């Protein structure tokens, strides 16, 4: 019935913000990547069938090689929640347990709709990031489309190196927009380059650069 | 068979390297499932 | 919109306010009076015919290189060095196929366009060198393997020593390099083309001259083309 | 699912937009002061074998044919009416042996209440189906596949092609090989999968358009094309909206527009 | 500030076509206009055909300035660079 399209859409999901952790660089075990949907329904779903949000949230911490390349990744923290709609209350409850436990980054997935409020608090929350993502589009990786190609961040001193080998500025360069899907799936900040390898009918093989607004 | 024996040890020891992962893992796991008890 | 774009000194493809719009020009970097369209060997067929086209074995005798057509058929079998080399060859080309079948071409096309057409540098060699009649080939097999990869890495797009114009430059000659690697195998030179040592040095050399007057020519008007 | 022509079908009932007013026939309003029983002969033996707020009565009578060929059940709409209406509405509904397919309500001067409430239902009332997906069709599509020995060899398999547009909710329908769903607009690419993605969805538009008829232009040129438009993050246009909100010098922009 | 030294210079070796024709049309100028010439003319008289001579033999006596996007520049002359 409809419960089980909701347990499985909620399943993908969690498996998408799964390898998305996995992307930007935090270790997720190997058991837990390929943890089946039985499984799932076993470790969240009640006897009457219905899902706790509040059992799904994790921590994740860099790989070393993840940490050696990139210095700024911080720890982790994941957490769905129940409420349909966040308020400011469930935003600033978010935050301020964020301060408290010191993440350096911290990922809200809801459901249906974010307050204007809770977005307007959102940049006022620094040094730590809050990012938010809707149910909805985390249902399928867009990362696996066969039309996007492989975006890899680059560290400062592979952007010195591009720099300076092009002889460019920093306003020079191909741009990708903040609020663009593979931007929001890597966790782009502004000022921050990738390397875009693609596929080329003339030469095989082109890799191209963009950096973030 | 030199070969072999070089593919049999890189294979050990990534296996070495993702028993430490592992491990390291579970106490996220742990603390990660405290702290969601301690939500509720 | 398209009026003040102009390919640069660099390589690069720019506007008037130096923003980078390509890195490469056709991510090649090639003219485009300069290609034709050629087939690239590896790419179709199957398992069978691209091991009895590529593969040379030096140990068994009935599937090695034929001994009225090379004058050191006697001192050829029993190598382990030579074997090695030709282990080498074979494996290049099975990574070549692999990216050709798996990223770059998935539907089987082999037919692009592409610079240097090498068939017709290979009858120009056959002409002007006489290699018709059944006398045996002085080219050895690793003068054969040695020039092909040494041409592979004097194709120069870009010049430079920093890295990242490395890798640029690598990337920028995939396909032609798998076409030269295709075309310009051991078994296919010795046995099908029927090459001699100073038609080999006339190929590589021609090969690499027609390469760079395939280059595309800096200070081009290619947004308004 | 795309070598099999039944669950391809299944999917494709899945995706397709369906509402109330596609398999609904004719509407009426009716006069009934009595809850537990009824004026009309016809519908009568029904009801009260059903049975064994005001006098106004809605009953609609639904095509049996398309009906049946959009492969619905009527205890479906029913569910699809309590849900939407909650309690507001007594429903009842003839079961599937009936002479006519027809399925009553009753509420809980209100003639002109009645009405719009009836052509709010017409309207609006979606019974399965991606919205914005107005018609779907089976397409077999001919595509060269390496064999067990290595050799290409041709195949067919089953794909579908809709009318309407929406991407994200489309590419997560099971069954749907999400991975490779296209769109022939390519402001949803961007919307949906990025920049990188408009870029080849453009790419591969402009080469359709060019080489139908037969034409060959060489690839290069395309590129920079798509290249200039997608340069800046977001798609430029080829008109005064893109050109001219550039940072490039003034008198250069004046001579155009 | 803005030159490039010689030993770093990273542009092509070859004459491009329009550095060709700038510099066949500024040598036949300056041959019309009474330049000393440094190719033996055997019965050559139009400054054109005389321009292509000092071309082949590389006896041209000025230098391409190349400018990159940036401002910098190359400095190359027309006897080191190879010309088809």
């Not at chain 1, 996007?148 to 990708?176: A, C, F, N, T």
């Not at chain 5, 770093?8 to 060709?20: C, Q």
Request: contains cysteine; hydrophobic residues 40%; charged residues 30%.
């Amino acid at each position: 019935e409809d419960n089980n399209r909701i347990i499985s859409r909620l399943w993908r999901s969690f498996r998408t913000v799964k390898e998305m952790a996995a992307d930007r660089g935090y270790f997720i075990s190997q058991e837990e990547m390929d943890q089946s949907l039985e499984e799932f329904r076993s470790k969240i779903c009640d006897s009457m069938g219905n899902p706790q949000r509040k059992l799904m949230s994790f921590l994740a911490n860099p790989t070393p090689e993840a940490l050696e390349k990139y210095s700024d990744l911080g720890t982790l923290w994941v957490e769905f929640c129940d409420e349909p709609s966040v308020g400011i209350k469930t935003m600033r409850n978010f935050c301020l347990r964020i301060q408290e436990k010191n993440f350096s980054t911290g990922i809200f997935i809801y459901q249906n709709n974010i307050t204007p409020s809770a977005n307007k608090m959102i940049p006022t929350v620094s040094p730590a990031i809050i990012e938010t993502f809707q149910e909805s589009d985390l249902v399928v990786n867009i990362t696996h489309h066969e039309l996007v190609p492989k975006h890899i961040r680059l560290s400062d001193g592979e952007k010195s190196q591009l720099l300076q080998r092009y002889k460019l500025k920093e306003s020079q360069l191909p741009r990708i927009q903040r609020e663009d899907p593979v931007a929001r799936y890597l966790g782009l900040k502004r000022g921050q380059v990738v390397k875009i390898i693609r596929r080329s009918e003339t030469s095989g093989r082109y890799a191209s650069y963009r950096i973030c607004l | 068979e030199k070969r072999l024996e070089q593919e049999q040890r890189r294979l050990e020891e990534a296996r070495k390297r993702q028993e430490a992962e592992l491990i390291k893992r579970q106490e996220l796991i742990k603390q990660a499932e405290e702290w969601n008890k301690m939500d509720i | 919109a398209l009026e003040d774009i102009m390919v640069h000194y660099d390589g690069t493809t720019r506007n008037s306010l130096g923003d980078i719009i390509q890195f490469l020009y056709g991510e090649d970097g090639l003219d485009g009076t300069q290609v034709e369209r050629q087939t690239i060997d590896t790419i179709p067929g199957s398992d069978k015919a691209f091991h009895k086209r590529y593969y040379v074995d030096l140990m068994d005798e009935k599937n090695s290189i034929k001994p009225d057509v090379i004058e050191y058929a006697a001192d050829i079998l029993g190598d382990v060095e030579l074997q090695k080399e030709l282990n080498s060859e074979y494996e290049q080309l099975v990574s070549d196929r692999k990216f050709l079948r798996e990223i770059v071409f998935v539907n089987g096309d082999h037919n692009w366009p592409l610079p240097v057409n090498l068939r017709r540098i290979i009858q120009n060699a056959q002409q002007i060198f006489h290699l018709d009649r059944a006398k045996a080939s002085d080219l050895t097999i690793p003068e054969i393997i040695h020039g092909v990869r040494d041409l592979c890495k004097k194709l120069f797009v870009l010049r430079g020593e920093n890295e990242l114009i490395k890798e640029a430059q690598q990337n920028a000659t995939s396909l032609f390099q798998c076409l030269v690697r295709a075309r310009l195998a051991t078994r296919r030179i010795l046995e099908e083309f029927r090459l001699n040592r100073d038609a080999f040095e006339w190929v590589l050399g021609t090969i690499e001259a027609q390469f760079q007057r395939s280059l595309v020519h800096p200070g081009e008007m290619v947004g308004v083309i | 699912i795309a070598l099999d022509i039944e669950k391809a079908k299944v999917i494709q009932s899945s995706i397709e937009y369906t509402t109330l007013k596609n398999v609904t026939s004719a509407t009426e309003i009716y006069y009934d002061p009595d809850p537990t029983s009824t004026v009309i002969e016809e519908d009568f033996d029904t009801v009260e074998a059903y049975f064994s707020q005001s006098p106004w009565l809605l009953r609609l009578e639904l095509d049996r044919a398309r009906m049946l060929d959009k492969q619905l059940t009527m205890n479906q709409v029913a569910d699809k009416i309590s849900e939407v209406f909650s309690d507001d509405l007594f429903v009842m509904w003839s079961e599937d042996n009936a002479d006519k397919l027809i399925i009553r309500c009753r509420v809980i001067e209100e003639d002109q209440m009645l009405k719009r409430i009836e052509a709010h239902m017409l309207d609006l009332i979606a019974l399965r189906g991606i919205p914005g997906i107005s018609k779907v069709y089976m397409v077999k599509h001919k595509v060269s596949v390496p064999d067990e020995s290595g050799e290409y060899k041709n195949e067919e398999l089953w794909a579908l092609e809709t009318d309407g547009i929406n991407l994200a909710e489309v590419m997560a329908v099971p069954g749907v090989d999400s991975s490779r769903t296209y769109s022939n607009s390519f402001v949803e690419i961007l919307s949906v999968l990025g920049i990188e993605a408009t870029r080849s969805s453009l790419y591969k538009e402009i080469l359709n358009v060019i080489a139908f008829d037969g034409s060959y232009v060489n690839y290069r040129h395309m590129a920079l094309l798509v290249d200039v438009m997608t340069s800046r993050g977001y798609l430029m246009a080829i008109t005064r909206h893109g050109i001219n909100r550039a940072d490039t010098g003034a008198l250069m922009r004046c001579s155009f527009e | 500030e803005l030159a490039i030294l010689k030993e770093e210079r990273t542009t092509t070796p070859y004459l491009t076509k329009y550095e060709r024709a700038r510099i066949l049309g500024t040598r036949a100028l300056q041959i019309s206009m009474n330049a000393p010439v440094l190719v033996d003319i055997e019965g050559e008289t139009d400054p054109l055909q005389i321009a292509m001579k000092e071309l082949s033999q590389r006896k041209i006596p000025l230098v391409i300035r190349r400018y990159l996007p940036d401002g910098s520049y190359e400095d190359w002359g027309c006897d080191e660079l190879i010309v088809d």
